Structures are given as C-alpha cells and as structure tokens.
C-alpha cells in the first residue's frame, strides 16, 4: 500500500497517494469532482476523479461498478483509459471512496468548434479517430449512447479520445441523438452512435448545430426536414402504434439532397454524411464500414484499426444489494493491473 496524504479542495476532502502531487480542480464542476495533478511515477499531468457518493443507493453502486468495469476494459488510442484506481480504505469494511486516474486531455470539441470552424483535413482526421474508437467499442458490444462534442477530447497534436463525462451538478445530448431512440427505445443498435458522429461531423464542417431541437418532438421535426419522412419500408418496421401514428400524422417531407445543404463541402464528406444520417438504422453505415470510406483515404489502415477483447456485460441484467455491488467494485479495485509506462 502506498502512503496517502490528505487535503481539502472546493468543499471536499481528497485523500490520495503521494505519487499524485499539486492537485488543482478543473472545469468548475463541469466534469465532476476532478483535479489535474502531477504524477511523480511518470512525470506526466493526469486527471484524478473522486466519485460522488458512489455507494449511496443500489443505483449509484451499480453505476460505480459499471464505470469501473468499462474503464478497466478500454485499451485503445482513441478511447479514455484507466491509468490507476485507488481508495484510501484498507479493507472492504472501510471502503467508501473511489478515485479514478486518467490522462489529462487538452480541450473538448465543443470548445474547439465554438472557437473556429475546422479545415476539411482536420475534419477528416478527427472523424476518422472517432470512428476508429467506435469500431473498438462496438466490437465489444458496448454502445456509447451519449456522443456529443463535449464527450470528445483532443490534445494540441489533434489526437482524440472518446469519453463520457456524464451529468452536471450547455450542449444538449438530444441534438446528437438518433431518431429511433428519440421516442421508442426497443429497436436500436450500435449505429445510434453513427447518427451522433454524422451530427458532430456536420457541425465541424459548418460551425452550426445541425439539429438544435427544443425537445423530443421539435428534434424529430428538424430531423425529418433533412432526411425526409419515413417511406412505406421503414414505416412497417415501427411497432409503436403511437409513434407510427405520430409520424404518419405529419405532412410528408422529401429527403433533401445533402449537396444542397452542405454547400461547398468536400463531396466525399457529403457522401459519408448521407450514409450516416439515414433514418433506417438497418441501413446506416457501421463504424468499420465508415473507416473504409474514400473520405478517409489518407488515414485508413486496415491493419491498425483493432477490435476489443470481449466484455462481460452479464452484470447488467443482475439485481443486487448495495453491499454486493460495493464488494464487486472493491474486487475490481484490488485486481487492477496498471498499464505499461514508457511514453
Ligand atoms: C453516468 C454516465 C452518463 C456515464 C459515466 N461515465 C462513464 O462511465 C465513462 C466510462 C467509460 C466510457 C468511455 C467511452 C466509451 C463508453 C464508456 N467514464 C469516463 O469516460 C471518464 C471517467 C473518468 C474521467 C476522469 N478524467 C477527467 O475527468 C478528465 C480528463 N481530461 N479532462 C479534460 C478534458 C478536456 C479539457 C480539460 C480537461 C478531464 N476533465 C474521465 C472520463
């Protein structure tokens, strides 16, 4: 066990290993309770997140377990990874705080698009990286579901990682959400995330939110204005009578020609957008397919777009007591094997 030191920061007690020095809060709460720190083992800046009331309820406890499991799994260049996880507790009995350590990222994409509209080259490279991380996540049967520009972090070298910062103690998730999981939430696949990548890529190209809806209905209306109302073939895959009635209640709208909307953009980018922003989720391009798209010719390397190890999601179906989820989380803290150092 390493030696821990104690301090207080912005309404909260941090007890961390001496390994981590010069803690300073970041984001004014925006990211959670998170400090930048210097990691003396590596000589690098890191981020240290203290989970908020991780075992307050069964729901918090399972969420805690879930986040730890997911972070321990992710081993890929374009996905946040886990550098360390610790608790000052010496036993399960005393276990009540969970701290996570990741790389410290430079800025989010929300900050970057709000600052400047990007070059077509920067768009190629950023979207390629998103898709490469998504091929990986999706290969483990993990769906992000919350993709938006504030959940993507980029450094000065333009290397990107996918994360999920979660709630706030503003960019609406709804603006980037697939129509199929806008009303019903039964019939959806991993390509909900590809819909979000299309919305993000549009905004990077244009500097404007593609579908800035006020609510779920308005959101749907903005969407169908671009992609058109569902034709007979998609209508007959909608089980929800109320959704089908709602859709069919609208004055029918044609699909726009995306070249008339994204006027002046690279045509290969326009063609990719058409393949991502398809209403029918069975017809939407997958991440693996998208990487082989001609828009990514300068980056795509089929020998360097790896899949994930399998991920055991079987816990998701379980209904357990708080002390059980806590003990499982403790197990995962104990079994953690830190990553290779040499960067
Ligand atoms: C509650 C619910 C909505 C989701 C909760 N979420 C999770 O479970 C995921 C778990 C892994 C996911 C990774 C992406 C793919 C899906 C799983 N969890 C994380 O992604 C996750 C967990 C911990 C951390 C800690 N790091 C930071 O906070 C951090 C790092 N850099 N910067 C930075 C960024 C830009 C500018 C300046 C500084 C930060 N602020 C970061 C992300």
Residues 6+ apart with CB under 8 A from 58: 320, 321, 322, 325
Which of 56, 59, 67, 129 should be mutated for ligand 1, with most atoms under 8 A from CB? 67
Query: Which of 287, 113, 82, 132 lies closest to 205 in space, CA to CA?
Result: 113
Resolution (A): 1.8
Q: What's the rounded Cα separation, in Å, for the pair 104 and 85?
A: 15
Distance of CA 48 from the midpoint of ligand 1 (Å): 10
Q: Residue of the nearest CA to atom 13 in ligand 1?
A: 163
Answer whether 67 contacts ligand 1 (Cβ < 6 A). yes
Query: To 10 degrees, what angle do helices 192-206 and 120-139 make?
Result: 170
Q: What's the rounded Cα separation, in Å, for the pair 99 and 37?
A: 13
3-class secondary structure, 47: strand
Q: What's the rounded Cα separation, in Å, for the pair 273 and 251?
A: 25
Residue 77 token pair: 């260049």
Query: Cα 23 to chain center, whole Å?
Result: 26
27 is in an annotated binding site: yes
* 228 within 8 A of 253, measured Cβ to Cβ: yes
Q: What's the rounded Cα separation, in Å, for the pair 213 and 205?
A: 19
Residue 183 token pair: 């009303």
Check residue 145 and give left, alpha or beta (phi > 0: left; psi -120 to 50: alpha).
left
Q: What's the rounded Cα separation, in Å, for the pair 9 and 4?
A: 16
Query: Which of 210, 217, 220, 224 lies closest to 255 in space, CA to CA?
Result: 224
Q: List for the chain the helix, strand, coil content (%; round to 5).
A: 40, 15, 45
Residue 121 token pair: 């080259």
CATH superfamily of 107-296: Transferase(Phosphotransferase) domain 1 (1.10.510.10)
- Beta strands at 99-103 and 84-86: parallel, antiparallel or unpaired: antiparallel
3-class secondary structure, 182: coil
* Technique used by the depositors: X-ray
Phi, psi of 13 (to 5 degrees): -95, 120
Answer whether 49 contacts ligand 1 (Cβ < 6 A). yes
Query: Which of 127, 208, 213, 217 lies closest to 175 in space, CA to CA?
Result: 213
Query: Cα 325 to chain center, whole Å?
Result: 24
Query: Cα 59 to chain center, whole Å?
Result: 21
Q: What's the rounded Cα separation, in Å, for the pair 163 and 151?
A: 5
> 147 to each of 11, 166, 175, 249, how far by Cα in Å?
30, 11, 10, 30
> 222 to each of 57, 94, 179, 237, 341, how far by Cα in Å?
38, 52, 10, 21, 47
Residues 6+ apart with CB under 8 A from 302: 291, 292
Q: Is 312 a catalytic residue?
A: no
Distance of CA 16 from the midpoint of ligand 1 (Å): 19
Q: Residue of the nearest CA to atom 2 in ligand 1?
A: 166
Answer whether 31 contacts ligand 1 (Cβ < 6 A). yes
């Amino acid at each position: 066990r390493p030696t821990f030191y104690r301090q207080e920061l912005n309404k909260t007690i941090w007890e961390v290993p001496e390994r981590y020095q010069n803690l300073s809060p970041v984001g004014s709460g925006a990211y959670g309770s998170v400090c930048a720190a210097f990691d003396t083992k590596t000589g690098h800046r890191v981020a240290v997140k203290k989970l908020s009331r991780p075992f307050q309820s069964i729901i918090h406890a399972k969420r805690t377990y879930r986040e730890l499991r997911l972070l321990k799994h992710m081993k890929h260049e374009n996905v946040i990874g886990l550098l360390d996880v610790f608790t000052p507790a010496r036993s399960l009995e005393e276990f009540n705080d969970v701290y996570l350590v990741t790389h410290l990222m430079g800025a989010d994409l929300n900050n970057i698009v709000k600052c400047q509209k990007l070059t077509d080259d920067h768009v190629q490279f950023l979207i390629y990286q998103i898709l490469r991380g998504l091929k990986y996540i999706h290969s483990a049967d993990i769906i992000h579901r919350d993709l938006k520009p504030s959940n993507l972090a980029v450094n000065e070298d333009c290397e990107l990682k996918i994360l999920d910062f979660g709630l706030a103690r503003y960019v609406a998730t709804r603006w980037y959400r697939a129509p199929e999981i806008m009303l019903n939430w039964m019939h959806y696949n991993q390509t909900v995330d590809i819909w979000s990548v299309g919305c993000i890529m549009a905004e990077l190209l244009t500097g404007r939110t593609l579908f800035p809806g006020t609510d779920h209905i308005d959101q749907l209306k903005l969407i169908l204005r671009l992609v058109g109302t569902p034709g007979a073939e998609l209508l007959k895959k909608i089980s929800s009578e109320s959704a089908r009635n709602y859709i069919q209640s609208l004055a029918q709208m044609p699909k726009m020609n995306f070249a008339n909307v994204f006027i002046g953009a690279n045509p290969l980018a326009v063609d990719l957008l058409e393949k991502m922003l398809v209403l029918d989720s069975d017809k939407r391009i997958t991440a693996a397919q998208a990487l082989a798209h001609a828009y990514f010719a300068q980056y795509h390397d089929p020998d360097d777009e790896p899949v994930a190890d399998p991920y055991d999601q079987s816990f998701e179906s379980r209904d357990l007591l708080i002390d059980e989820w806590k003990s499982l989380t403790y197990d995962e803290v104990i079994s953690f094997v830190p990553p290779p150092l040499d960067q």
